[PDB]
Amino acid sequence: QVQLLESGAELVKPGASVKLSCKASGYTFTSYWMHWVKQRPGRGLEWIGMIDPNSGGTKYNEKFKSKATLTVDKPSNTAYMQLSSLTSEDSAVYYCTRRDMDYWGAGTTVTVSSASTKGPSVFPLAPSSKSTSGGTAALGCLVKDYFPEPVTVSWNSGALTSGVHTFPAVLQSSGLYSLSSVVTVPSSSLGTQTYICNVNHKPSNTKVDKKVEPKS
Amino acid sequence: ELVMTQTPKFMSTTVGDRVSITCKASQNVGTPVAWYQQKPGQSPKLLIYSASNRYTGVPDRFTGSGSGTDFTLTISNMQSEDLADYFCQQYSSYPLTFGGGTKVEIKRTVAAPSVFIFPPSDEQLKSGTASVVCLLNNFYPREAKVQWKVDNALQSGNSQESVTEQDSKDSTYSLSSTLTLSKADYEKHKVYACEVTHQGLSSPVTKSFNRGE
């Protein structure tokens, strides 16, 4: 399968520089050009530029001519994009896509801020008689007090996706974020199934697995 | 730079209805025009290219057309899973340009919310803070009101909420409200209630608890 995997620092200081990466797999990296597209949440898409993983030729958008610098690494089959003199306007999601934009990566989020990162605390939202409905029970995890976004939340290592609602994070007056992730499961098997929320916050090196159990 | 003016910005349709989006080129793009579909939380996905060609896998429901400067994307039997943001793109000249985008929302039948409430965890309490969470699951329309009441006193300034994007399967929404107090203030009361108001309810629904276990 053709796969583009982006990655890189998600929290960076203003005036600094950050280098994003795109690891390609499932196809001859050097046979297709690579594009980098920018997107500010809720806003439009922007073409930053492209590169030929074979020659090294680059074609930038006049707009990011001085902001971005694309490069590649044949040995590792990965393309890179470096952004300089970062400002709040560089905070956005960045994607890498094949020449024909038929394949896109998942995207990397960048938050330009001088504020320091803060890892989240993960508390269980335990299932109980007050979180019951028509034979189903809602349970989940509260991920609070973290900076910056995003924080990824999976249930049972991705084996539990149905009935899951991971809410948009809210901003607390302190400037820190909080979010909740819930899921509705059968009330009958609360005693035999195990539910664990896997929380990951890259900027703070946070990796938590919190088992959620009935209130007793 | 050859801009693509895309309309409408937003659209509300019902399953089965026909939807059409338009992109007018600033200059003139023969046929190098593409359309992408971006579902919530996902990355753009190639839908149409060359103005009328459909990328592999893309269902016949999607059809593109237009030439010269005016282009349109048409989705016939509008399905639930088709809710998303759509973008047109010009790739005839550099720099590559994208239309402003159109958010296609689905209109469906009224669905009242299911309400759940979660007291603070012991782990959090031992940390000196108490957060109470109220969940409003799978309702429609998106508009809903939540009011926190402690010992029957309406709260203000101590809660935050967020609403999900529309669900691609049942076209409903869900909402989460968090009432955060200090472990101290939380212990000066016994009744924590979440009062919900919504179009699918004939009168306010209240979910609450005291402080057992």
Side-chain angles (χ1 to χ4, degrees), chain B residues 22-138:
Chain B
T22 316
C23 267
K24 192 174 300 179
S26 181
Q27 311 298 301
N28 175 295
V29 186
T31 59
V33 176
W35 293 89
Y36 303 79
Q37 175 197 63
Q38 186 171 211
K39 243 178 289 296
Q42 293 179 178
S43 46
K45 188 195 77 175
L46 185 59
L47 226 58
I48 303 298
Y49 58 96
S50 185
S52 65
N53 279 303
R54 306 186 303 206
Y55 189 59
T56 74
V58 185
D60 62 294
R61 289 201 298 295
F62 302 91
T63 70
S65 63
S67 63
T69 67
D70 290 55
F71 305 86
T72 61
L73 172 64
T74 305
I75 308 173
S76 302
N77 188 49
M78 251 299 277
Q79 296 313 80
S80 302
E81 59 252 57
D82 304 321
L83 74 76
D85 282 337
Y86 289 91
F87 299 97
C88 69
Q89 185 208 196
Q90 163 287 102
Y91 60 102
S92 69
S93 66
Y94 287 103
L96 274 36
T97 300
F98 288 101
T102 304
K103 168 182 293 301
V104 177
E105 286 283 70
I106 292 173
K107 200 144 54 186
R108 58 150 287 160
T109 60
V110 171
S114 286
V115 187
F116 312 75
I117 184 156
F118 298 94
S121 65
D122 301 307
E123 25 262 288
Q124 178 182 24
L125 288 173
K126 70 181 300 176
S127 298
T129 302
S131 291
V132 189
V133 173
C134 188
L135 175 62
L136 285 62
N137 233 18
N138 321 302

Side-chain angles (χ1 to χ4, degrees), chain A residues 35 37 39 42-47 50 59-63 95 100-107 122-133 136-140 142 144 163 165-173 178 180 182-184 210 215-216, chain B residues 1 9 36 38 41-46 55 85 87 89 94-100 114-125 127 129 131 133 135-138 160-165 167 172-176 178 180 207-210 212-213:
Chain A
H35 298 94
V37 179
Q39 174 173 51
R43 298 288 257 288
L45 294 159
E46 292 185 73
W47 177 75
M50 64 192 278
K59 217 298 167 54
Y60 303 78
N61 178 315
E62 194 72 314
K63 190 80 82 302
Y95 301 96
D100 303 318
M101 303 194 169
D102 44 347
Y103 291 103
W104 293 66
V122 177
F123 308 113
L125 291 180
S128 74
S129 59
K130 257 48 180 296
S131 80
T132 189
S133 194
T136 80
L139 67 84
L142 184 62
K144 65 118 57 185
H165 291 308
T166 295
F167 296 80
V170 292
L171 238 180
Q172 295 164 300
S173 40
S178 283
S180 58
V182 302
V183 59
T184 46
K210 177 68 62 179
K215 193 67 179 180
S216 57
Chain B
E1 62 167 354
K9 283 237 63 180
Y36 303 79
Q38 186 171 211
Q42 293 179 178
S43 46
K45 188 195 77 175
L46 185 59
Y55 189 59
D85 282 337
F87 299 97
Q89 185 208 196
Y94 287 103
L96 274 36
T97 300
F98 288 101
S114 286
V115 187
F116 312 75
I117 184 156
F118 298 94
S121 65
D122 301 307
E123 25 262 288
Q124 178 182 24
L125 288 173
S127 298
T129 302
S131 291
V133 173
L135 175 62
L136 285 62
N137 233 18
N138 321 302
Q160 300 90 45
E161 69 174 38
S162 70
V163 180
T164 313
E165 56 264 36
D167 180 77
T172 64
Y173 295 91
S174 286
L175 180 158
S176 171
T178 299
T180 308
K207 283 286 295 180
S208 63
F209 70 80
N210 303 310
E213 282 296 357

Side-chain angles (χ1 to χ4, degrees), chain A residues 62-113:
Chain A
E62 194 72 314
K63 190 80 82 302
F64 313 78
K65 185 70 71 175
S66 49
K67 176 70 62 178
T69 297
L70 317 184
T71 53
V72 301
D73 173 44
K74 284 75 167 181
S76 175
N77 296 99
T78 73
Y80 298 111
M81 176 179 85
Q82 188 168 61
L83 307 169
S84 55
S85 297
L86 298 161
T87 63
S88 58
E89 292 172 49
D90 289 300
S91 295
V93 174
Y94 296 90
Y95 301 96
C96 59
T97 170
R98 199 93 129 313
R99 76 182 182 198
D100 303 318
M101 303 194 169
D102 44 347
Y103 291 103
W104 293 66
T108 300
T109 310
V110 177
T111 298
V112 177
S113 178

